[PDB]
A paper describes a structure:
Tripartite motif (TRIM) family proteins are RING-type E3 ligases that play key regulatory roles in innate immune signalling pathways that lead to the induction of a type I interferon (IFN) response and production of inflammatory cytokines through activation of the IRF3 and NF-κB transcription factors. Activation of RIG-I initiates a signalling cascade that depends on the E3 ligase activity of TRIM25 and induces the production of IFNs and inflammatory cytokines. An example is non-structural protein 1 (NS1) of influenza A viruses (IAV), a multifunctional virulence factor that binds many host proteins during infection, including TRIM2527–29. To understand NS1-mediated inhibition of TRIM25 activity on a molecular level we have determined crystal structures of the CC domain of TRIM25 in complex with NS1-FL and the isolated ED, and of a TRIM25 CC-PRYSPRY fragment, which includes the RIG-I-recognition domain of TRIM25.
In parallel we performed NMR titrations between the separate CC and PRYSPRY domains. These experiments show that the interaction between the two domains is weak in solution but involves the interface observed in the crystal structure as mutation of Y463S and Y476S weakened the interaction even further. The functional importance of this interface for the correct positioning of the PRYSPRY to enable substrate ubiquitination is highlighted by the almost complete loss of RIG-I-2CARD ubiquitination upon mutation of these residues although the overall fold of the PRYSPRY domain remains intact. Taken together, these experiments suggest that in the absence of other components of the system, the PRYSPRY domain is in a dynamic equilibrium between a bound state and a constrained diffusing state tethered to the CC by the flexible linker, in agreement with recent results, but that the bound state is important to enable substrate ubiquitination.
Author numbering: 432 to 629
Amino acid sequence: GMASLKAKVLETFLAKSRPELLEYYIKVILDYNTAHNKVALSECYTVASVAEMPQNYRPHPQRFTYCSQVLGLHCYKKGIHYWEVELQKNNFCGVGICYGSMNRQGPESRLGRNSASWCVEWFNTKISAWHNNVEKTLPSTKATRVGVLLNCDHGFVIFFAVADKVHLMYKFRVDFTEALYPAFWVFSAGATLSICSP
């Protein structure tokens, strides 16, 4: 019964317009203590890019040591939330969510490559959705912006491509077991991920 009701709510959210999604807006700020040495933060901690000069980070237990990732400041276990990320030179980069308990060290700390995270990703300019180290290739888009709809109350996440209107990239139904952080990956030179304020 819950699964049948969840499905009807999911269809409603898949059909929402951008103004309707923006009603769930949440302000995401990047967490300085999580950024890998190769990740530079700028514009009042709303932009992540690949560092071209030393960032002079101190080692921190919450800092990613293996891959070029960074988290948002806050995590969410209740409510329904929406944020957007503008991309430049998106040859190798990723946008997703993860449990706080995701490992921050070693190969398994990569977004979508473990059971604690979900993401969409550009990889040699080709798009895929990832969870639990299982890939789903997706059609290309000319959009330069991703919208993430995180629904903790009903249990799903949706990734939208945002241009003049919104288009589905991929979704996951999940009965989440703990709070979720926005999460980001920037790997190719010149790649930038900018959190939007519309």
